[PDB]
């Protein structure tokens, strides 16, 4: 999350994330800072108990790296997550928050398993019971009109989808965000 302490006030800054991670440079080293501090730096002091322990397993995911320290490099795909930048951008940064977590080429029954990387039917809405129905149905009717599983230009394609599912997708790639899931 983060230190600001209030939801309008990001709004207000529009870019209090981004400020905050140039002037980290003059405080932590050139690039190079742990995972408990970077976690302390930005929050999670009090008031997240079960939704730290479900943060634990979206870290270890959007870590990519799956390393015990963070790099210069992360802070760059860190950017990526909080904004979008260019368009041309968001496709490649879109690819690279699956870090290839498999063999390569994913199908729907794969989709379900990394589905809860996303998140589970924790929304008071949406999902009328399991929002693994909803992957398979939009599937279903898209059948990629051969070539169901996905490669590497119909990657691109899973966000197409819908937009209920992206909508949902939308918040779980976050940063500061998530506070909103929290408040949900």
């Not at 634990?56 to 930048?85: C, P, R």
């Not at 368009?87 to 879109?94: D, I, P």
């Not at 390569?104 to 129905?133: H, V």
Request: aromatic share 12%.
């Amino acid at each position: 999350g983060n230190i600001m302490d209030g939801k309008s006030v990001e709004e207000l800054s529009s870019t209090e994330c981004h400020q905050w991670y140039k002037k980290f440079m003059t405080e932590c080293p050139s690039g190079q800072l742990t995972l408990y501090e970077f976690r302390q730096f930005f929050g999670l002091k009090n008031l997240s108990p079960w939704a730290s322990q479900y943060v634990e397993q979206m870290f270890e995911t959007f870590d990519f790296n799956k390393d015990g320290y963070i790099d210069f490099m992360e802070y760059e795909a860190a950017l990526s997550l909080v904004l979008k930048g260019k368009v041309e951008q968001k496709l490649r940064w879109y690819f690279k928050l699956y870090d290839v977590d498999g063999n390569g080429c994913i199908d729907r029954d794969e989709l379900l398993t990394i589905i809860r990387a996303i998140r589970a039917i924790n929304p008071c809405s949406d999902s009328t019971m399991t929002a693994e129905e909803f992957t398979d149905t939009v599937f279903s009717k898209i059948d990629v009109n051969g070539d169901g599983e996905l490669s590497l230009e119909e990657f691109m394609e899973g966000v197409q989808k819908d937009q209920m599912l992206l909508d949902t997708l939308t918040r779980s790639l976050d940063l500061t965000r998530i506070v909103r899931r929290l408040q949900n």
